């Protein structure tokens, strides 16, 4: 390795196609120029578009993948014999200098392309850089975001849906054990891993995924598992007699020695402990499914409901109109930031909006647009059935500090804390909204007759990018449901 | 009752009067209502 590194860096004629300067091997330009030529079009640059699962085409981005694979495999051995004390530090310094090469994470981020090249990409980081520090793992937090999302969708015994590249994906995830050897915001990769064992497509490959879920909780905080334990307990109670024998292993690993200095609650552990007790006796005998189960205590929904024949009582007469006007005021503030002004004749070029007027004079189209989601939401939890309060002192509709007297003002209502029961109700409403989105996705998929989308997935599947929008919508729900003296609870 | 939009409620601007025998002005409201508290000159020090 030392000799080949010395000779290759003495004679770097492996030039790059786009970037200038002596040498080359600039992935940040070569990979990006090669994908636009290879993915949609054919092997040549000027060429028509054809080819599905096609694994100047397959040449350059495999030649590179081989090059960084060779560099990673010839990187000096780490943390077994040599740890910065064997004169081999100059080789690692040269490899890091070839920062530009630190952008291997950025290179792997461009997920649309053979899945096997990502194995070399992560192997380079394992060899020359290492993720032993928590900062890089906090930066990434996933082996691959879109690959993890896509492996969830590609799980079925179908011809055109899976069993085409999912095997290569499974091999790449088998390689992907970098997190092995204190979650800050929300690491939820074990929920993604839960889908893998539901239907074991690759035989014997679940052994590589067992420690990814096992050792994760040891590093993870007990409280960081919030409602994913509830979902997993639901699935475990459903499949208490199943080939998924890692459920009891996770049960033991959590319940035993999950009691830290905090000594967290066991009331939520009582809900599935009785289910496990009542489901362990009707089965007659398994040889190892009940051995370690000695101490279990310290001491997908596409259609939520149907509201075709639900009548809304007319207890909403004033606050609904007030909050519709508040939403219109927020829209007016947004269009004022855009540059729109009130006028008489609508004109897109001149940025004239004649709708800058009170809700009583507003148009029926925008009135229905503002009223339909709120009315549908109210109908939904009225259909579910919960109590409604009318507290007198909760009247915070108008308490914070142009033509027709239209003077909207910004209100900072995001500083208010809400209760856990109201949070659960808003989470149910958010699940209903996600199911509505899933319904529109199913309708458009049926209309198109073919396609796939990785957003037909539960809460924990969502990464931070979409979770930001989800939290913004949840905050809007909190703002709507925290005022007007109306309280909903069980 | 003006209810200034956003954080535009005066920000407690201070204006020392030429005489400490009568009164010193330290208000945040847009209009004066009542801050008399007639006391003899006592102290003027770091803002608290």
């Amino acid at each position: 390795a030392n000799v080949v590194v010395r000779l290759l860096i003495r004679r770097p004629e492996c030039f790059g196609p786009a970037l200038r300067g002596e040498g080359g091997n600039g992935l940040l330009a070569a990979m990006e120029e090669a994908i636009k030529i290879a993915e949609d079009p054919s092997r040549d640059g000027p060429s028509p578009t054809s080819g599905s699962s096609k694994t100047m085409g397959n040449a350059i981005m495999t030649f590179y993948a081989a090059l960084i694979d060779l560099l990673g495999r010839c990187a000096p051995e780490m943390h077994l014999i040599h740890a910065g004390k064997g004169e081999a530090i100059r080789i690692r310094s040269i490899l890091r200098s070839l920062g530009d090469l630190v952008g291997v994470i950025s290179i792997a981020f461009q997920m649309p392309f053979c899945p096997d090249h990502k194995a070399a990409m992560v192997l380079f980081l394992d060899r020359v850089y290492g993720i032993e520090v928590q900062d890089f793992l906090l930066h990434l937090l996933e082996v691959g975001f879109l690959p993890d999302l896509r492996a969830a969708a590609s799980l079925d015994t179908a011809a055109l849906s899976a069993t085409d590249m999912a095997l290569a994906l499974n091999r790449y995830l088998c390689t992907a054990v970098l997190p092995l050897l204190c979650g800050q915001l929300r690491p939820s990769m074990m929920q993604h891993l839960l889908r893998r064992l539901v239907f074991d497509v690759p035989l014997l490959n679940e052994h590589a995924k067992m420690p990814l879920k096992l050792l994760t909780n040891h590093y993870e905080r007990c409280w960081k598992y919030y409602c994913l334990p509830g979902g997993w307990g639901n699935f475990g109670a459903a499949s208490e007699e199943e080939l998924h024998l890692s459920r009891k292993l996770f049960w033991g690993i959590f319940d035993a020695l999950s009691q830290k200095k905090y000594e967290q609650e066991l009331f939520k552990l009582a809900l599935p402990c009785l289910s496990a007790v009542a489901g362990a006796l009707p089965p007659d005998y398994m040889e190892s499914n009940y051995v370690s189960m000695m101490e279990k205590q310290s001491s997908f929904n596409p259609q939520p409901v149907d509201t075709s024949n639900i009548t809304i009582p007319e207890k909403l007469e004033y606050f609904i109109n007030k909050y519709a006007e508040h939403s219109h005021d927020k829209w007016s503030m947004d269009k004022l930031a855009n540059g729109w002004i009130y006028g008489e004749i609508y004109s897109d070029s001149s940025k004239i909006q004649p709708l800058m007027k009170p809700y009583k004079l507003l148009s029926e189209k925008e009135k229905e647009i503002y009223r339909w989601p709120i009315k549908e939401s109210l109908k939904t939890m009225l259909a579910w059935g919960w109590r409604i309060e009318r507290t007198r002192e909760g009247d915070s509709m108008a308490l914070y500090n142009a033509a027709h007297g239209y003077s909207p003002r910004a209100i900072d209502m995001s500083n208010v804390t809400l209760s856990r029961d109201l949070h659960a109700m808003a989470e149910m409403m958010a699940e209903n909204y996600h199911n509505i989105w899933a319904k529109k996705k199913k309708l458009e998929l049926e209309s198109k007759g073919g396609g796939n989308h990785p957003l037909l997935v539960p809460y924990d599947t969502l990464t931070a990018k979409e979770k930001a929008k989800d939290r913004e919508k949840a905050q809007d729900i909190f703002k709507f449901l925290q005022i007007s003296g109306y309280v909903v609870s069980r | 009752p003006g209810q200034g939009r956003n954080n535009s409620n005066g920000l407690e601007i201070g204006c020392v009067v030429d005489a400490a025998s009568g009164l010193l002005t330290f208000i945040a409201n847009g209009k004066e209502l009542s801050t008399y508290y007639q006391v003899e000159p006592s102290t003027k020090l770091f803002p608290a």
Binding site: - | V16, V17, D18
Partner: peptide, 30 residues
């Protein structure tokens, strides 16, 4: 004798009062 003037030492210890968390009391102390 601040002739041709209203007051002096125009300054403020600014606290944003528009949020009104609990309708805070503001004034001098002895």
């Amino acid at each position: 004798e601040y002739l041709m003037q209203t007051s002096t030492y125009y300054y403020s210890v600014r606290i944003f009062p528009g949020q009104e968390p609990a309708n805070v009391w503001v004034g001098w102390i002895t």
